[PDB]
Protein backbone atom coordinates (compact mmCIF):
# COMPACT_ATOMS: atom_id res chain seq x y z
CA UNK A 1 0.00 0.00 0.00
CA UNK A 2 1.36 3.30 -1.21
CA UNK A 3 1.46 5.81 1.63
CA UNK A 4 2.93 9.24 2.35
CA UNK A 5 3.62 10.15 5.99
CA UNK A 6 4.47 13.75 6.86
CA UNK A 7 6.26 15.37 9.79
CA UNK A 8 4.33 16.92 12.66
CA UNK A 9 2.63 20.27 13.12
CA UNK A 10 4.52 23.25 14.48
CA UNK A 11 4.40 26.99 15.06
CA UNK A 12 7.09 29.16 13.49
CA UNK A 13 7.81 32.82 14.09
CA UNK A 14 7.27 35.28 11.23
CA UNK A 15 10.49 35.54 9.26
CA UNK A 16 11.64 32.03 10.17
CA UNK A 17 11.75 29.02 7.87
CA UNK A 18 9.91 25.71 8.04
CA UNK A 19 10.99 22.41 6.51
CA UNK A 20 8.29 19.75 6.19
CA UNK A 21 9.12 16.13 5.36
CA UNK A 22 7.11 13.51 3.48
CA UNK A 23 8.22 9.88 3.68
CA UNK A 24 7.03 7.58 0.90
CA UNK A 25 6.44 3.87 1.41
CA UNK A 26 4.95 1.01 -0.55
CA UNK A 27 6.53 1.94 -3.88
CA UNK A 28 9.87 2.82 -5.42
CA UNK A 29 10.33 6.52 -4.64
CA UNK A 30 11.85 7.53 -7.97
CA UNK A 31 8.88 6.33 -10.03
CA UNK A 32 6.53 9.26 -9.35
CA UNK A 33 6.60 13.03 -9.02
CA UNK A 34 5.52 14.44 -5.65
CA UNK A 35 3.70 17.75 -5.28
CA UNK A 36 3.28 20.07 -2.33
CA UNK A 37 -0.18 21.64 -2.00
CA UNK A 38 -1.26 23.85 0.90
CA UNK A 39 -4.59 24.96 2.29
CA UNK A 40 -5.03 27.96 4.54
CA UNK A 41 -7.81 27.71 7.16
CA UNK A 42 -11.18 27.75 5.41
CA UNK A 43 -9.59 28.40 2.01
CA UNK A 44 -8.86 26.43 -1.15
CA UNK A 45 -6.01 24.25 -2.34
CA UNK A 46 -2.90 26.04 -3.56
CA UNK A 47 -0.19 24.27 -5.56
CA UNK A 48 3.33 25.08 -4.42
CA UNK A 49 5.50 22.92 -6.62
CA UNK A 50 6.68 19.44 -7.47
CA UNK A 51 9.88 17.41 -7.27
CA UNK A 52 10.83 14.44 -9.42
CA UNK A 53 12.89 12.18 -7.10
CA UNK A 54 14.40 10.34 -10.09
CA UNK A 55 15.98 13.46 -11.62
CA UNK A 56 16.00 15.95 -8.72
CA UNK A 57 14.13 18.34 -11.02
CA UNK A 58 11.56 20.69 -9.53
CA UNK A 59 9.09 23.38 -10.45
CA UNK A 60 7.54 25.99 -8.15
CA UNK A 61 4.53 28.27 -8.35
CA UNK A 62 5.40 31.83 -9.29
CA UNK A 63 4.13 33.09 -5.93
CA UNK A 64 6.85 31.11 -4.13
CA UNK A 65 9.79 31.38 -6.54
CA UNK A 66 12.83 32.52 -4.59
CA UNK A 67 11.34 31.55 -1.23
CA UNK A 68 10.73 27.78 -1.50
CA UNK A 69 12.87 24.79 -2.31
CA UNK A 70 11.99 21.13 -2.58
CA UNK A 71 14.56 18.38 -2.09
CA UNK A 72 14.65 14.60 -1.76
CA UNK A 73 16.75 11.95 0.00
CA UNK A 74 16.42 8.69 -1.94
CA UNK A 75 18.18 6.60 0.73
CA UNK A 76 15.20 7.24 3.07
CA UNK A 77 12.48 7.74 0.42
CA UNK A 78 11.73 11.24 1.71
CA UNK A 79 10.89 14.55 0.03
CA UNK A 80 11.00 17.95 1.72
CA UNK A 81 9.55 21.41 1.24
CA UNK A 82 11.36 24.33 2.87
CA UNK A 83 9.58 27.69 2.90
CA UNK A 84 11.64 30.65 4.11
CA UNK A 85 10.91 34.16 5.37
CA UNK A 86 7.57 32.97 6.69
CA UNK A 87 4.54 35.26 6.46
CA UNK A 88 1.50 35.15 8.72
CA UNK A 89 -0.53 34.14 5.66
CA UNK A 90 1.71 31.11 5.17
CA UNK A 91 -0.37 29.59 8.00
CA UNK A 92 -1.86 26.48 6.39
CA UNK A 93 -2.06 22.73 6.24
CA UNK A 94 0.74 21.61 3.92
CA UNK A 95 0.17 18.36 2.02
CA UNK A 96 2.48 16.27 -0.04
CA UNK A 97 0.70 14.37 -2.79
CA UNK A 98 1.99 11.83 -5.28
CA UNK A 99 1.40 12.37 -8.98
CA UNK A 100 -0.18 9.23 -10.43
CA UNK A 101 1.65 9.89 -13.70
CA UNK A 102 0.13 10.13 -17.16
CA UNK A 103 -1.12 6.80 -18.49
CA UNK A 104 0.73 7.13 -21.80
CA UNK A 105 3.81 9.22 -20.91
CA UNK A 106 6.38 8.88 -18.11
CA UNK A 107 5.51 12.40 -17.06
CA UNK A 108 3.53 14.34 -14.47
CA UNK A 109 -0.18 14.88 -14.90
CA UNK A 110 -1.40 17.01 -12.01
CA UNK A 111 -3.54 14.01 -11.03
CA UNK A 112 -2.55 13.38 -7.42
CA UNK A 113 -3.58 9.92 -6.23
CA UNK A 114 -2.06 9.41 -2.77
CA UNK A 115 -1.98 12.28 -0.27
CA UNK A 116 -0.04 12.65 2.94
CA UNK A 117 -1.98 13.37 6.10
CA UNK A 118 -1.04 17.07 6.09
CA UNK A 119 1.15 19.18 8.36
CA UNK A 120 -0.43 22.16 10.13
CA UNK A 121 2.05 25.06 10.10
CA UNK A 122 1.06 28.12 12.12
CA UNK A 123 3.07 31.30 11.57
CA UNK A 124 2.78 33.33 14.76
CA UNK A 125 4.95 35.04 17.34
CA UNK A 126 2.88 33.35 20.05
CA UNK A 127 4.59 30.56 21.95
CA UNK A 128 3.62 26.92 22.06
CA UNK A 129 1.50 25.90 25.05
CA UNK A 130 0.45 22.33 25.76
CA UNK A 131 -3.11 21.60 26.92
CA UNK A 132 -4.45 20.68 30.30
CA UNK A 133 -6.78 17.69 30.02
CA UNK A 134 -9.75 17.14 32.30
CA UNK A 135 -12.27 14.30 32.32
CA UNK A 136 -15.93 14.92 31.52
CA UNK A 137 -17.57 12.18 33.54
CA UNK A 138 -20.72 10.33 32.46
CA UNK A 139 -23.75 10.91 34.63
CA UNK A 140 -27.49 10.41 34.64
CA UNK A 141 -27.58 13.96 33.23
CA UNK A 142 -25.45 12.94 30.22
CA UNK A 143 -27.54 9.76 29.75
CA UNK A 144 -30.57 9.36 27.48
CA UNK A 145 -32.07 6.58 25.38
CA UNK A 146 -29.79 3.92 26.84
CA UNK A 147 -26.54 5.76 26.06
CA UNK A 148 -24.22 7.88 28.19
CA UNK A 149 -21.96 10.72 27.03
CA UNK A 150 -18.49 11.07 28.52
CA UNK A 151 -15.47 12.93 27.31
CA UNK A 152 -12.31 14.94 27.78
CA UNK A 153 -11.85 18.70 27.91
CA UNK A 154 -8.59 19.80 26.25
CA UNK A 155 -7.97 23.27 27.62
CA UNK A 156 -5.83 26.31 26.79
CA UNK A 157 -3.38 25.16 24.11
CA UNK A 158 -1.61 26.77 21.17
CA UNK A 159 -1.27 26.28 18.20
CA UNK A 160 -3.67 23.87 16.54
CA UNK A 161 -3.99 20.93 16.16
CA UNK A 162 -4.80 18.44 18.88
CA UNK A 163 -5.82 14.87 18.21
CA UNK A 164 -7.93 12.78 20.57
CA UNK A 165 -8.35 9.04 20.38
CA UNK A 166 -10.21 6.75 22.75
CA UNK A 167 -8.81 3.52 24.16
CA UNK A 168 -5.74 3.89 21.95
CA UNK A 169 -7.83 4.08 18.79
CA UNK A 170 -9.82 0.88 19.34
CA UNK A 171 -13.01 2.89 20.02
CA UNK A 172 -14.32 5.00 17.14
CA UNK A 173 -18.06 4.32 17.20
CA UNK A 174 -19.85 7.25 18.78
CA UNK A 175 -16.72 9.41 19.13
CA UNK A 176 -17.30 13.08 18.35
CA UNK A 177 -14.33 15.39 18.68
CA UNK A 178 -15.63 18.92 18.42
CA UNK A 179 -13.77 21.69 16.59
CA UNK A 180 -11.83 23.94 18.94
CA UNK A 181 -12.90 27.34 20.15
CA UNK A 182 -10.34 30.13 19.70
CA UNK A 183 -10.87 32.02 22.92
CA UNK A 184 -10.46 35.75 23.41
CA UNK A 185 -7.18 34.90 25.20
CA UNK A 186 -5.74 33.56 21.95
CA UNK A 187 -5.61 29.97 23.26
CA UNK A 188 -7.70 27.11 21.93
CA UNK A 189 -9.84 24.60 23.78
CA UNK A 190 -11.75 21.60 22.49
CA UNK A 191 -13.75 18.66 23.79
CA UNK A 192 -14.07 15.06 22.65
CA UNK A 193 -17.13 13.04 23.67
CA UNK A 194 -17.81 9.34 23.26
CA UNK A 195 -21.42 8.17 23.48
CA UNK A 196 -21.61 4.59 24.75
CA UNK A 197 -24.21 2.15 26.07
CA UNK A 198 -25.04 3.04 29.67
CA UNK A 199 -25.03 -0.67 30.52
CA UNK A 200 -21.32 -0.77 29.55
CA UNK A 201 -20.17 1.68 32.22
CA UNK A 202 -19.57 -0.94 34.92
CA UNK A 203 -17.25 -3.16 32.85
CA UNK A 204 -15.65 -0.99 30.13
CA UNK A 205 -12.89 1.52 30.84
CA UNK A 206 -12.60 4.72 28.79
CA UNK A 207 -9.30 6.57 28.32
CA UNK A 208 -8.80 9.60 26.10
CA UNK A 209 -5.42 9.86 24.41
CA UNK A 210 -4.63 13.52 23.70
CA UNK A 211 -1.73 14.51 21.44
CA UNK A 212 -0.48 18.07 20.95
CA UNK A 213 2.45 17.56 18.60
CA UNK A 214 3.50 21.25 18.52
CA UNK A 215 4.50 20.86 22.19
CA UNK A 216 5.56 17.18 21.76
CA UNK A 217 3.20 16.29 24.61
CA UNK A 218 0.70 13.46 24.93
CA UNK A 219 -1.63 12.98 27.90
CA UNK A 220 -3.82 9.96 28.63
CA UNK A 221 -6.76 10.55 30.98
CA UNK A 222 -9.11 7.98 32.51
CA UNK A 223 -12.77 9.04 32.39
CA UNK A 224 -14.89 7.43 35.10
CA UNK A 225 -18.11 8.25 36.95
CA UNK A 226 -17.69 10.47 40.00
Amino acid sequence: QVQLVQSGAEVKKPGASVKVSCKASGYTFTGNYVHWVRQAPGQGLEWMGWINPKSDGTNYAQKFQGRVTMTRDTSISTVYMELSRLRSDDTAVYYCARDKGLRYFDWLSGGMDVWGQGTTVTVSSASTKGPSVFPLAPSSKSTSGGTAALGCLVKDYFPEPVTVSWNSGALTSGVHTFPAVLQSSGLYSLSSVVTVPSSSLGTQTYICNVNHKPSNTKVDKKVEPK
Binding site: H35, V37, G44, L45, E46, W47, W50, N59, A61, Y95, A97, K100, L102, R103, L108, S109, G110, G111, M112, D113, W115, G116, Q117, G118, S132, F134, P135, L136, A137, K141, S142, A149, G151, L153, K155, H176, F178, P179, A180, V181, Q183, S184, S189, L190, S191, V193, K226
Partner: protein, 211 residues
Protein backbone atom coordinates in the same frame (compact mmCIF):
# COMPACT_ATOMS: atom_id res chain seq x y z
CA UNK B 1 -6.02 31.14 -12.47
CA UNK B 2 -9.01 28.79 -12.75
CA UNK B 3 -12.44 30.00 -11.64
CA UNK B 4 -15.07 27.76 -10.03
CA UNK B 5 -18.47 28.78 -8.64
CA UNK B 6 -18.37 29.04 -4.86
CA UNK B 7 -21.52 26.94 -4.40
CA UNK B 8 -23.68 24.53 -6.40
CA UNK B 9 -26.81 22.76 -5.16
CA UNK B 10 -29.22 20.05 -6.29
CA UNK B 11 -31.93 17.77 -4.95
CA UNK B 12 -31.36 14.06 -4.22
CA UNK B 13 -31.20 11.96 -7.38
CA UNK B 14 -30.50 14.95 -9.66
CA UNK B 15 -27.42 15.83 -11.68
CA UNK B 16 -25.36 18.96 -11.08
CA UNK B 17 -22.35 20.42 -12.91
CA UNK B 18 -19.30 22.25 -11.56
CA UNK B 19 -17.29 24.46 -13.91
CA UNK B 20 -13.56 25.19 -14.00
CA UNK B 21 -12.68 28.09 -16.29
CA UNK B 22 -9.57 30.03 -17.23
CA UNK B 23 -9.96 33.73 -16.46
CA UNK B 24 -8.71 34.74 -19.96
CA UNK B 25 -6.64 37.63 -18.53
CA UNK B 26 -3.63 35.42 -18.94
CA UNK B 27 -2.67 32.86 -21.66
CA UNK B 28 -1.46 29.46 -20.46
CA UNK B 29 -1.77 26.13 -22.28
CA UNK B 30 -3.82 24.00 -19.90
CA UNK B 31 -3.62 20.29 -20.65
CA UNK B 32 -4.70 17.54 -18.25
CA UNK B 33 -7.60 18.23 -15.89
CA UNK B 34 -8.18 16.40 -12.63
CA UNK B 35 -10.93 16.75 -10.04
CA UNK B 36 -10.84 16.28 -6.27
CA UNK B 37 -13.45 15.85 -3.57
CA UNK B 38 -12.69 17.03 -0.04
CA UNK B 39 -14.88 16.26 2.93
CA UNK B 40 -14.53 18.27 6.16
CA UNK B 41 -11.34 17.44 8.02
CA UNK B 42 -10.02 15.06 5.35
CA UNK B 43 -7.38 15.15 2.66
CA UNK B 44 -8.54 15.69 -0.94
CA UNK B 45 -9.52 12.58 -2.91
CA UNK B 46 -8.86 12.19 -6.65
CA UNK B 47 -12.15 11.61 -8.51
CA UNK B 48 -11.17 12.28 -12.15
CA UNK B 49 -7.84 12.26 -13.97
CA UNK B 50 -6.92 13.06 -17.58
CA UNK B 51 -10.19 14.97 -18.06
CA UNK B 52 -12.65 12.08 -17.92
CA UNK B 53 -11.18 8.97 -16.24
CA UNK B 54 -12.13 7.54 -12.85
CA UNK B 55 -9.71 5.86 -10.42
CA UNK B 56 -10.72 2.40 -9.31
CA UNK B 57 -13.53 2.52 -6.79
CA UNK B 58 -14.80 5.98 -7.76
CA UNK B 59 -18.54 6.03 -8.45
CA UNK B 60 -19.61 6.21 -12.10
CA UNK B 61 -21.91 9.04 -10.97
CA UNK B 62 -18.88 11.32 -11.48
CA UNK B 63 -17.98 12.31 -15.05
CA UNK B 64 -15.50 14.86 -16.40
CA UNK B 65 -15.45 16.92 -19.61
CA UNK B 66 -13.40 19.71 -21.19
CA UNK B 67 -14.03 22.22 -23.98
CA UNK B 68 -11.37 24.80 -24.77
CA UNK B 69 -10.68 27.04 -21.80
CA UNK B 70 -13.24 25.39 -19.48
CA UNK B 71 -13.68 21.96 -17.92
CA UNK B 72 -16.55 20.54 -15.92
CA UNK B 73 -17.52 17.79 -13.50
CA UNK B 74 -21.05 16.38 -13.55
CA UNK B 75 -22.37 14.48 -10.51
CA UNK B 76 -25.43 12.37 -11.32
CA UNK B 77 -27.87 10.72 -8.92
CA UNK B 78 -26.89 13.19 -6.21
CA UNK B 79 -26.53 11.55 -2.79
CA UNK B 80 -26.13 13.04 0.71
CA UNK B 81 -22.50 11.88 0.90
CA UNK B 82 -21.73 14.09 -2.11
CA UNK B 83 -21.90 17.16 0.14
CA UNK B 84 -18.25 18.23 0.08
CA UNK B 85 -15.87 20.71 -1.57
CA UNK B 86 -14.74 19.98 -5.13
CA UNK B 87 -11.58 21.28 -6.79
CA UNK B 88 -10.44 21.17 -10.37
CA UNK B 89 -6.78 21.15 -11.21
CA UNK B 90 -4.93 21.50 -14.49
CA UNK B 91 -1.35 20.95 -15.52
CA UNK B 92 0.14 23.28 -18.12
CA UNK B 93 2.60 23.00 -20.99
CA UNK B 94 5.06 24.74 -18.63
CA UNK B 95 4.76 21.83 -16.14
CA UNK B 96 3.00 23.97 -13.56
CA UNK B 97 -0.24 22.98 -11.86
CA UNK B 98 -3.14 25.29 -11.03
CA UNK B 99 -6.13 24.55 -8.79
CA UNK B 100 -9.52 26.16 -9.14
CA UNK B 101 -10.93 27.98 -6.14
CA UNK B 102 -13.23 25.17 -4.99
CA UNK B 103 -16.99 24.62 -5.03
CA UNK B 104 -19.15 23.53 -2.09
CA UNK B 105 -21.98 21.15 -3.05
CA UNK B 106 -25.26 21.30 -1.12
CA UNK B 107 -27.93 18.61 -1.34
CA UNK B 108 -31.28 20.38 -1.04
CA UNK B 109 -34.34 19.14 0.79
CA UNK B 110 -32.76 17.92 4.02
CA UNK B 111 -35.25 18.18 6.90
CA UNK B 112 -34.95 20.17 10.07
CA UNK B 113 -33.10 18.34 12.84
CA UNK B 114 -33.25 19.60 16.42
CA UNK B 115 -29.95 19.95 18.32
CA UNK B 116 -28.79 17.45 20.88
CA UNK B 117 -27.32 19.40 23.81
CA UNK B 118 -24.90 17.85 26.30
CA UNK B 119 -23.85 20.03 29.23
CA UNK B 120 -20.97 19.06 31.52
CA UNK B 121 -20.19 20.72 34.85
CA UNK B 122 -16.62 21.41 35.99
CA UNK B 123 -14.51 18.37 36.77
CA UNK B 124 -13.16 17.80 40.26
CA UNK B 125 -9.63 18.08 38.87
CA UNK B 126 -10.29 21.45 37.26
CA UNK B 127 -11.83 22.81 40.46
CA UNK B 128 -8.72 21.64 42.31
CA UNK B 129 -6.71 23.79 39.86
CA UNK B 130 -8.82 26.81 40.96
CA UNK B 131 -10.69 27.01 37.64
CA UNK B 132 -14.15 26.01 36.42
CA UNK B 133 -15.42 25.46 32.87
CA UNK B 134 -18.96 24.54 31.86
CA UNK B 135 -18.96 22.70 28.53
CA UNK B 136 -22.03 22.85 26.28
CA UNK B 137 -21.77 20.54 23.26
CA UNK B 138 -24.36 20.96 20.52
CA UNK B 139 -24.72 18.34 17.80
CA UNK B 140 -26.86 16.84 15.05
CA UNK B 141 -28.71 20.04 14.12
CA UNK B 142 -29.87 21.09 10.66
CA UNK B 143 -29.78 23.68 9.15
CA UNK B 144 -26.43 24.75 10.51
CA UNK B 145 -27.09 27.81 12.67
CA UNK B 146 -27.71 28.14 16.42
CA UNK B 147 -27.44 30.84 19.07
CA UNK B 148 -26.36 30.13 22.65
CA UNK B 149 -27.36 31.87 25.87
CA UNK B 150 -26.05 31.03 29.33
CA UNK B 151 -27.81 31.56 32.65
CA UNK B 152 -26.68 31.63 36.26
CA UNK B 153 -29.76 30.45 38.11
CA UNK B 154 -32.34 32.41 36.08
CA UNK B 155 -30.15 35.39 35.20
CA UNK B 156 -28.31 35.77 31.87
CA UNK B 157 -24.53 35.56 32.04
CA UNK B 158 -22.54 37.05 29.17
CA UNK B 159 -19.03 37.30 30.64
CA UNK B 160 -16.64 34.40 30.17
CA UNK B 161 -18.48 32.90 27.16
CA UNK B 162 -16.70 31.44 24.13
CA UNK B 163 -18.79 29.84 21.37
CA UNK B 164 -17.64 28.24 18.13
CA UNK B 165 -18.98 28.62 14.63
CA UNK B 166 -21.14 25.72 13.43
CA UNK B 167 -19.22 22.90 11.77
CA UNK B 168 -20.38 20.28 9.27
CA UNK B 169 -20.47 16.76 10.70
CA UNK B 170 -19.77 13.64 8.67
CA UNK B 171 -23.51 12.83 8.72
CA UNK B 172 -24.22 16.23 7.07
CA UNK B 173 -25.74 17.75 10.22
CA UNK B 174 -23.89 20.40 12.26
CA UNK B 175 -22.14 20.83 15.59
CA UNK B 176 -21.01 23.69 17.80
CA UNK B 177 -19.68 24.15 21.31
CA UNK B 178 -19.90 26.84 23.94
CA UNK B 179 -17.75 27.23 27.04
CA UNK B 180 -18.51 29.26 30.17
CA UNK B 181 -15.58 30.17 32.42
CA UNK B 182 -16.30 30.66 36.12
CA UNK B 183 -14.34 30.83 39.30
CA UNK B 184 -14.91 27.98 41.75
CA UNK B 185 -16.62 30.53 44.02
CA UNK B 186 -19.09 31.48 41.29
CA UNK B 187 -19.86 27.87 40.42
CA UNK B 188 -20.57 27.08 44.08
CA UNK B 189 -22.45 30.32 44.83
CA UNK B 190 -25.40 29.52 42.51
CA UNK B 191 -28.04 26.81 42.57
CA UNK B 192 -27.51 25.95 38.90
CA UNK B 193 -26.29 27.11 35.51
CA UNK B 194 -27.97 26.58 32.15
CA UNK B 195 -26.96 26.46 28.50
CA UNK B 196 -29.88 27.45 26.25
CA UNK B 197 -29.57 26.68 22.54
CA UNK B 198 -31.90 28.35 20.03
CA UNK B 199 -32.32 26.62 16.67
CA UNK B 200 -34.88 27.61 14.04
CA UNK B 201 -37.06 29.41 16.56
CA UNK B 202 -37.16 26.65 19.21
CA UNK B 203 -34.96 26.14 22.25
CA UNK B 204 -33.30 23.21 23.96
CA UNK B 205 -31.93 24.12 27.39
CA UNK B 206 -29.85 21.98 29.74
CA UNK B 207 -29.10 22.66 33.41
CA UNK B 208 -26.31 21.45 35.70
CA UNK B 209 -25.67 22.11 39.37
CA UNK B 210 -22.91 21.74 41.96
CA UNK B 211 -25.30 20.26 44.51
Amino acid sequence: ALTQPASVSGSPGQSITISCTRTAAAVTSYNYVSWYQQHPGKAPKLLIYEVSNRPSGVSNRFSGSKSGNSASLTISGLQPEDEADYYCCSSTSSTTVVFGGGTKVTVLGQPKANPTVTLFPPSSEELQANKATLVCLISDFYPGAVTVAWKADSSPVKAGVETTTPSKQSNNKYAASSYLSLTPEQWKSHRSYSCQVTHEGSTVEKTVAPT
